[PDB]
Enzyme design. Structure first.
Site, PDB file in Angstrom:
ATOM      1  N   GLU A  35       0.798  -1.217   0.000  1.00 26.41           N
ATOM      2  CA  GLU A  35       0.000   0.000   0.000  1.00 26.41           C
ATOM      3  C   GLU A  35       0.838   1.277   0.000  1.00 26.41           C
ATOM      4  O   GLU A  35       0.561   2.203  -0.767  1.00 26.41           O
ATOM      5  CB  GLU A  35      -0.957   0.044   1.198  1.00 26.41           C
ATOM      6  N   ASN A  46      -7.509   9.562  -6.148  1.00 27.71           N
ATOM      7  CA  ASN A  46      -8.268   8.728  -7.058  1.00 27.71           C
ATOM      8  C   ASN A  46      -9.113   9.694  -7.865  1.00 27.71           C
ATOM      9  O   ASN A  46     -10.138  10.181  -7.397  1.00 27.71           O
ATOM     10  CB  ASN A  46      -9.142   7.745  -6.267  1.00 27.71           C
ATOM     11  N   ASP A  49     -13.081   8.949  -8.552  1.00 24.46           N
ATOM     12  CA  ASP A  49     -14.143   9.193  -7.590  1.00 24.46           C
ATOM     13  C   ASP A  49     -13.868  10.366  -6.651  1.00 24.46           C
ATOM     14  O   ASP A  49     -14.640  10.620  -5.730  1.00 24.46           O
ATOM     15  CB  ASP A  49     -14.488   7.905  -6.819  1.00 24.46           C
ATOM     16  N   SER A  51     -11.578  10.736  -4.292  1.00 23.80           N
ATOM     17  CA  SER A  51     -11.224  10.426  -2.915  1.00 23.80           C
ATOM     18  C   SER A  51      -9.708  10.290  -2.870  1.00 23.80           C
ATOM     19  O   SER A  51      -9.052  10.215  -3.912  1.00 23.80           O
ATOM     20  CB  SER A  51     -11.932   9.151  -2.405  1.00 23.80           C
ATOM     21  N   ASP A  53      -6.361   8.310  -0.664  1.00 26.84           N
ATOM     22  CA  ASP A  53      -5.932   7.303   0.304  1.00 26.84           C
ATOM     23  C   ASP A  53      -4.770   7.937   1.085  1.00 26.84           C
ATOM     24  O   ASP A  53      -3.854   8.516   0.492  1.00 26.84           O
ATOM     25  CB  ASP A  53      -5.475   6.025  -0.407  1.00 26.84           C
ATOM     26  N   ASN A  60      -8.933   5.237   2.980  1.00 31.33           N
ATOM     27  CA  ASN A  60      -9.738   6.095   2.101  1.00 31.33           C
ATOM     28  C   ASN A  60     -10.630   7.149   2.748  1.00 31.33           C
ATOM     29  O   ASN A  60     -11.389   6.857   3.691  1.00 31.33           O
ATOM     30  CB  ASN A  60     -10.552   5.191   1.175  1.00 31.33           C
TER      31      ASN A  60
END
Length: 130
Positions: A35, A46, A49, A51, A53, A60
């Site tokens: 990750e 992202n 959408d 959003s 991380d 998220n």
């Protein structure tokens, strides 16, 4: 902060992650490696959408932490996303525990299915003293 492998292993153990909701330390290590590369300041946007991380576990903003700019967001872990960018990972750990408390468990992270599930993950904690 960019953690060294064993240094992170011991820290996660001290924070009660070993066997949390049936998830072994080696699996949490596998998750962090893919990750963020054990990097606490890692962030990923992202575009699709809107959003982002945040941190070592790439938590998220749509469901777990609040950053204000994520459309139709929720804050299940009840934290500012800013907290997940600290060198001290206690808040990131509490958030990760919250995520796996939902039925999907560790499967909530797609990276875990692709790189960790059904594999030999011993290599992530081998030699660390945990």
């Amino acid at each position: 902060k960019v953690f060294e492998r064993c240094e992170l292993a011991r820290t996660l153990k001290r924070l009660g992650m070993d066997g949390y909701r049936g998830i072994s330390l080696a699996n949490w290590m596998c998750l962090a490696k893919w990750e963020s590369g054990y990097n606490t300041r890692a962030t990923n946007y992202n575009a699709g959408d809107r959003s982002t991380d945040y941190g070592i576990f790439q938590i998220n903003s749509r469901y777990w932490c609040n950053d204000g700019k994520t459309p139709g967001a929720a804050n299940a872990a009840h934290l500012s996303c800013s907290a997940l960018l600290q060198d001290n990972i206690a808040d990131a750990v509490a958030a990760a525990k919250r995520v796996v408390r939902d039925p999907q468990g560790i499967r909530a992270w797609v990276a875990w299915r692709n790189r960790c599930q059904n594999r030999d993950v011993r290599q992530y904690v081998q030699g660390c003293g945990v």
